[PDB]
Amino acid sequence: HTCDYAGCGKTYTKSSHLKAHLRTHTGEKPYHCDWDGCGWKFARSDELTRHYRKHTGHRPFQCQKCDRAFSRSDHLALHMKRH
DNA sequence: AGGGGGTGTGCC
DNA sequence: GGCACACCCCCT
Ligand code: NA
Ligand SMILES: [Zn+2]
Ligand SMILES: [Zn+2]
Ligand SMILES: [Zn+2]
């Protein structure tokens, strides 16, 4: 599975990863946020899922040193480092 | 400090 | 296919 966009030639082992990679060339953002008044659109479905947590307020990653909770694991990891 | 999007990569 | 981690780079 090779990318035939201009002088690229990037290879992938799965179809889904190449199809998502081609979106970085065509600029297509198929995953729209349906929240009222938002308007954000993303090229990968996981970006929209992560973005929805800002609307829903879901904070699954909880710090065990204090009481702060975060919606993303990297935000919790950085919070633990600079604790 | 907290809070976002972009991107690559490995797993289900 | 999506999910999620990890990291980057940005803004607040
Ligand atoms: Na495939
Ligand atoms: Zn390409
Ligand atoms: Zn939104
Ligand atoms: Zn803490």
Residue numbers in the entry: 430 to 512
Task: Kindly provide excerpts from the paper associated with this entry.
Krüppel like factor 4 (KLF4) is a key constituent of reprogramming cocktails that transform fibroblasts to induced pluripotent stem cells (iPSCs). Here, we show that reprogramming factor KLF4 undergoes biomolecular condensation even in the absence of its intrinsically disordered region. Surprisingly, the intrinsically disordered region is not essential for KLF4 condensation in cells, and a KLF4 fragment comprising the isolated DNA binding domain (DBD) condenses with DNA in vitro. We propose that bridging and/or condensation with DNA in a sequence- and CpG methylation-dependent manner underlie KLF4 function as a key chromatin organizer and pioneer transcription factor in somatic cell reprogramming.
We determined the crystal structure of the 1:1 complex of DBD bound to a dodecamer containing the NANOG proximal promoter KLFA site. Residues R473 and R479 of ZnF2 (in positions −1 and 6) and R501 of ZnF3 (in position −1) hydrogen bond with the N7s and O6s of bases G5, G6, and G8, respectively; the arginine side chains also make polar interactions with water, ions, and/or aspartate side chains. As in previously solved structures, ZnF1 makes fewer base-specific contacts than ZnF2 or ZnF3. The only base-specific contact made by ZnF1 in this structure is H446 (in position 3) hydrogen bonding to N2 of base G10. KLF4 DBD binds to the GGTG of our dodecamer with the same conformation as it does to the GGmCG of a decamer (87 Cα-atoms superimpose with a root-mean-square deviation of 0.97 Å). However, canonical DBD occupation of both KLFA and KLFB causes intermonomer clashes of the two modeled ZnF1 domains. We conclude that in the observed 3:1 complexes, at least one ZnF1 projects away from the DNA. Single molecule methods show that KLF4 tandem zinc fingers bring together short DNA duplexes in dilute solution by a bridging interaction.
